[PDB]
Design a protein around this ligand. Structure first.
Ligand SMILES: *[C@@H]1O[C@H](CO)[C@@H](O)[C@H](O)[C@H]1NC(C)=O
Ligand SMILES: *[C@@H]1O[C@H](CO)[C@@H](O)[C@H](O)[C@H]1NC(C)=O
Ligand SMILES: *[C@@H]1O[C@H](CO)[C@@H](O)[C@H](O)[C@H]1NC(C)=O
Ligand SMILES: OC[C@H]1O[C@@H](O)[C@H](O)[C@@H](O)[C@@H]1O
Ligand SMILES: OC[C@H]1O[C@@H](O)[C@H](O)[C@@H](O)[C@@H]1O
Length: 604
């Protein structure tokens, strides 16, 4: 008709649609695209009136506890309907931290955290996990995942070290395969730096956090990374170029500083390097109150935060609450000439480029036939395979002449499963699982270590559970062997920053009591290397299981010899925290276990 609007015509080239829509937009409509808000402050009027571009769920931001996939779809579609009702009918994009599966959602498959995936040295397995995670995120109506974290964690005292595949940038680079899993494979022609998402069964990805998040002093989270440019480029930057080659749609900026310059205010790196040198053409998003945190105290000159960030080259702001103040301030700056219209139009071009490329104008709403992808058994099988491949066997016998303890026999008259982490699903998942910080106990659907033991063993095997048994209990029990599981409690971000890296009690004391009475395999649950010589000295066998997720059977698959141990350390294991930082390749390199170490077993 001559009611035709070029931007709404799905047969037209993305760039022509972007230009067409951009040319029609008011300032308010443009700045609205640049604003991401929390679901917690969203309403239909707020979305319509402020022309909002994006919404997110932060860690723990859910419609309710226990919500079904359908509840999520209906929430997301309620917000979209309001956005589609604007004058221009620009669909919002909804983001979430789906960083080891669709991990805020009850019943979602929970994969091993990144450090364990690094142990697999299996980029294809990580691609398959991206694929499955895309399906589980679209199950809930969500179109955008804030992953992967491509930090290169150079000191395990950092609370986010588990979100890093490896201290070795080459392993992190290999694991950028998550990207084309989440988003689809890019076409043969593809230009490096262009955004890509295949369509409605994939999600937009986010390479985070740009750049040097893993390089901070003493592993202090969100702190300063002191390193010359050569080292920034040799260690922290290279996986970002792999991400551009694979069409990553967005990039999130780090809270951290580089030689004292806040990343959220770094024009040279965000615009000079990422955009102008790597030729990134997707959108750049802030972290959560990242612009606020440019100043100290945070939020003490929000006007400056806005100016600095948007001049630096950020495109979309994760406000996420004070939207009215953000929009008002940015509007003032453009009205005054402080921020030119060229900058606004660039940010909006990039946001719209991602939205059109990914099909969001053609499929703004959820597909209810996708809901049943959540927690699907084929995905649990994949997570079980990833958990097993992530395990690193550190010791299997106290002397070189002992019978190797693992693999254990499935038939025995009576066995003991013990420890604070043997029957606790939340501990085995760690942080970013249902809550931001994670949680304790049966927080979602899965199989604990105890549960997996009872599922694996011969029917005649009697399984006894005791969380913290004393030495007498064990010696009197008539046990053939024991499986004892201990380690770190869940943590995320600054909460996990830890200068001592010693596991909480009772952990060691239980291992001591158990191993002192019966031959024992110790399963260590952690986000990183921790002080381990005492646990080793007590144990016949010891496994570094990292944070393996919902599928505890991956642990028993290897314990009982269904598969051999194959994982290798993706990080150095230190002897003492006084050595840190200490990485493969330094001068004073004196590891307990070097990067790449891992004992093997043969199946059956
Ligand atoms: C690093 O942390 C120190 C110690 O708390 C703090 O005072 C300093 O401002 C931080 N620096 C950053 C975040 O750049
Ligand atoms: C070791 O660090 C953790 C968290 O930072 C703390 O819970 C534990 O009690 C610490 N002990 C110290 C700093 O002496
Ligand atoms: C596993 O197989 C390889 C040879 O195929 C051998 O080197 C290793 O020692 C074997 N261990 C056992 C228990 O068979
Ligand atoms: O209060 C918890 C919230 O605080 C923020 O700092 C976290 O990043 C969000 O992901 C989370 O929803
Ligand atoms: O949940 C939103 C954001 O919260 C921030 O605290 C984290 O640093 C990001 O990794 C995360 O995507």
């Amino acid at each position: 008709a001559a009611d035709y609007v070029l931007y709404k015509d799905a047969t037209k080239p993305v760039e022509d649609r972007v230009a067409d829509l951009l040319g029609r937009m008011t300032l308010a409509e443009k700045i609205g695209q640049m604003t991401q808000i929390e679901r917690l402050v969203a309403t239909p009027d707020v979305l319509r009136d402020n022309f909002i571009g994006s919404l997110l769920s932060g860690g723990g931001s859910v419609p309710r506890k226990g919500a079904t996939a359908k509840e999520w779809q209906d929430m997301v579609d309620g917000f979209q309907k309001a956005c589609m009702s604007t004058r221009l009918g620009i669909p919002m994009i909804y983001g979430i931290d789906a960083v080891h599966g669709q991990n805020n959602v009850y019943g979602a498959t929970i994969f091993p955290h990144n450090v364990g995936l690094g142990a697999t040295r299996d980029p294809y397995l990580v691609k398959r996990i991206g694929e499955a995670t895309a399906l589980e995120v679209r199950a809930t109506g969500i179109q955008y995942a804030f992953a992967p974290c491509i930090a290169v964690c150079r000191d395990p005292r950092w609370g986010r070290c588990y979100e890093s595949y490896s201290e070795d940038r080459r392993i992190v680079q290999s694991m950028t395969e998550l990207i084309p899993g989440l988003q689809g494979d890019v076409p043969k022609d593809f230009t490096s730096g262009m955004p890509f998402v295949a369509g409605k069964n994939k999600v937009a990805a986010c390479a985070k956090h740009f750049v040097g998040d893993g390089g901070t002093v003493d592993g202090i989270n969100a702190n300063n990374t002191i390193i010359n440019r050569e080292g920034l480029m040799n260690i922290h930057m290279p996986a970002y170029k792999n991400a551009m080659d694979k069409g990553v749609s967005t990039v999130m900026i780090s809270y951290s500083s580089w030689n004292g310059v806040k990343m959220h205010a770094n024009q040279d790196l965000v615009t000079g390097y990422l955009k102008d040198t790597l030729k990134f053409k997707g959108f750049v998003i802030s972290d959560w109150e990242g612009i606020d945190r440019i100043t100290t105290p945070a939020g003490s000159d929000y006007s400056y935060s806005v100016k600095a960030s948007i001049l630096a080259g950020l495109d979309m702001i994760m406000v996420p609450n004070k939207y009215q103040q953000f929009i008002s301030i940015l509007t003032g700056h453009v009205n005054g000439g402080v921020i030119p219209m060229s900058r606004i139009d660039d940010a909006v071009t990039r946001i719209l480029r991602v939205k059109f490329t990914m099909g969001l104008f053609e499929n703004p709403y959820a597909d209810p036939a996708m809901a049943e992808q959540l927690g699907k058994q084929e995905h649990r099988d994949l997570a079980r395979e990833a958990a097993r491949k992530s395990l690193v066997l550190l010791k299997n016998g106290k002397t070189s002449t002992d019978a190797p303890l693992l693999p254990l026999p499935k038939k025995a008259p009576k066995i003991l499963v013990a420890g604070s982490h043997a029957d606790n699903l939340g501990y085995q998942c760690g942080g970013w699982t249902i809550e931001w910080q994670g949680d304790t106990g049966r927080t979602t659907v899965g199989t604990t270590i105890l549960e997996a033991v009872k599922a694996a063993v011969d029917p005649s095997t009697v399984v006894v559970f005791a969380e913290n048994p004393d030495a007498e209990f064990v010696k009197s029990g008539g046990f053939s062997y024991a499986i004892v599981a201990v380690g770190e409690h869940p943590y995320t971000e600054t909460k996990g920053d830890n200068l001592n890296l010693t596991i909480p009690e009772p952990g060691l004391s239980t291992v001591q009591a158990v191993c002192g009475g019966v031959r024992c395999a110790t399963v260590l649950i952690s986000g990183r290397p921790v002080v381990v010589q005492p646990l080793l000295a007590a144990s016949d066998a010891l496994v570094a299981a990292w944070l393996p997720g919902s599928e505890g059977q991956g642990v028993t698959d290897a314990l009982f010899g269904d598969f051999g141990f194959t994982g290798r350390l993706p990080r150095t294991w230190f002897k003492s925290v006084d050595q840190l930082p200490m990485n493969v390749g330094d001068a004073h390199y004196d590891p307990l276990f070097r990067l790449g170490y891992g004992l093997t077993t043969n199946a059956t």
